Ligand binder design. Structure first.
Ligand code: U6Y
Ligand code: U6Y
Lengths: 303, 303
């Protein structure tokens, strides 16, 4: 019992974090096998960052201009290339702590663990969702660029995020490990705005199931609805439209609780229209959308 | 920018978690040097748990009745003793992954990271406070007993909590690593109730400073107050009384923001009396008390 925002254990990722320095700029890199991954803006001077030509800035850079440091030890850079918005530095030593891993580009609404790092050293770990507007609600200071997001499947680390930037609303944007931004963001110091911050409906439903599993059922009402009827109300509150695929994903939680998804949708509809009347659900006063159905099942079944 | 509930990186603690089995009961233990620590109720049958005599139950137990398993490997138990509500199992192998560590009994209002474990394997990591009523708001299932809470000071792990039980309100209770419960709880299957859940005032103040640091200052009003005036309102809302020691601890955040602690107390007073008017502070609709002043400074300064 109880329900918390829970990160993956970070040990396997801690052993991959290094410091990368190019001139005066020090950020985080990810050391897997004989390659270090880091944001390409490590090569920028404070003036370059205004409107950089990365191709031109790389003409000026050689292997020896990248200092890679793994705790107290200097790694030897024997190659470098740019892939989209990431630099890949080939080093002469395979990381002996390299876990089983893969690179994934995550879908909007999916969650991952962030290991916030400074100067190649772990600060802390917390869970984030890739929001529909391709931003995340993180906690990142100067020095955090190159911090990574990940999931763990038993022993395999799925790396899905590399931290690059902060946006006006105090939210964050970054790339997959192939250097492609989530969203329409670019790695330059120009004003960029997040689009409408739509709510992940299927995750709100999942969290309401979690509330029922933990004995909090005050908000279950006597109504049901239809997908089309619910979605008319969703669009009004900038909720993602619910589809049969979403209903299917909530199936195991519906089965566990004996509450049909469309009955839970009806309860969600009345919470949207009437608010919580100063009551709380799993210790929250607002509707939480950063738990996936899998996060709920995992937590409630001890995976 | 941004502000999140952040756990310590868990790698150094992951390497200490083992499975302990006594008969049909399997729980978590903590392997440091040549000693495994676990809850003494590992020795209880499902009937024993109703009113156990632990001293008598231990007459029946020998070294060979404790199965300790570290991943795939069986450790050899060469000694056992009970210290308060914990068992200490002496094994013939020092844990080679033992970090620098200490055992601390934490004060009410202080925070720590929990590594939730099942069958000796890490499930996830999240931050908790030791509440004034000596309970924590965790996420624990059957199998989680022996999961530990900790802080990290640079390289040194301070272990402060071992998980034993759940309470009616869906909150949790456990011991320090010397086997002494936080609070008046006992390790037996009898109905136990948490006392009044008082709010950690100094931590709410800290979180309001965090809000100001992150540009959220809508709730700063034109008033100041006195310790005694504030405390009259505190006691009404079951807040901890504020003392000069609390003011001194908030000093660095006051200095950082240029908001005198007693001005922030006046803002807190009006939030208690008037509520948030459906507004939010750092993405929350209620007053958060599980961040210490140190948690705020650490997060806002990249420690
Ligand atoms: C990382 O580059 C970083 O940590 N660098 C290490 C060397 C110190 C940094 C992380 C940010 C900084 C604060 N919190 C974070 O997450 N990222 C940047 O500074 C971004 C640099 C670009 C990728 C080149 N960056 C640029 C900045 N953009 C900006 O100022 O645009 C103009 C603007 C005008 C008005 C209002 C707002 C913005 C945001 C950003 O993160
Ligand atoms: C741990 O013992 C555990 O994980 N054991 C491993 C072998 C499976 C367990 C953890 C709990 C279980 C669910 N979530 C948790 O955190 N702890 C217990 O089961 C406690 C056992 C005692 C320490 C011996 N325990 C006893 C139970 N008490 C109880 O039922 O009292 C009567 C009551 C009456 C009415 C209403 C409520 C309670 C609570 C508890 O955690």
């Amino acid at each position: 019992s109880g329900f918390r925002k829970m990160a993956f254990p970070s040990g396997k990722v801690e052993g991959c974090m290094v410091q990368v320095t190019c001139g005066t700029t020090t950020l985080n890199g990810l050391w897997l096998d004989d390659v270090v991954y880091c944001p390409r803006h490590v090569i920028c001077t404070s003036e370059d960052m205004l409107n950089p030509n990365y191709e031109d800035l790389l003409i000026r850079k050689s292997n020896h201009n990248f200092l890679v440091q793994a705790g107290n030890v200097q790694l030897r850079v024997i190659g470098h290339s740019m892939q989209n918005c990431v630099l890949k530095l080939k080093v002469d030593t395979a990381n002996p702590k390299t876990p089983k891993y893969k690179f994934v580009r995550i879908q909007p609404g999916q969650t991952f663990s962030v290991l916030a790092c400074y100067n190649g050293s772990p600060s802390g770990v917390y869970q984030c969702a890739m929001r529909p507007n391709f931003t995340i609600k993180g906690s990142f200071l100067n020095g955090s660029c190159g911090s990574v997001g990940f999931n763990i499947d038993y022993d395999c680390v799925s790396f899905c995020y590399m931290h690059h930037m902060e946006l006006p609303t105090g939210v964050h944007a970054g790339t997959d490990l192939e250097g492609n931004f989530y969203g329409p963001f670019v790695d330059r110091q120009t004003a960029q705005a997040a689009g409408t911050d739509t709510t992940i409906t299927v995750n709100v439903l999942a969290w309401l199931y979690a509330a029922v599993i933990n004995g909090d059922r005050w908000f279950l009402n006597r109504f049901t609805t239809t997908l089309n009827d619910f979605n008319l109300v969703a669009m009004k509150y900038n909720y993602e439209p619910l589809t049969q695929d979403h209903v299917d994903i909530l199936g195991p939680l519906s089965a566990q609780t004996g509450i049909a998804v469309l009955d839970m949708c009806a309860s969600l509809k009345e919470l949207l229209q009437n608010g919580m009347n100063g009551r709380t659900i799993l210790g929250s006063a607002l509707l939480e959308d950063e738990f996936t159905p899998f996060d709920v099942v995992r937590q409630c079944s001890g995976v």
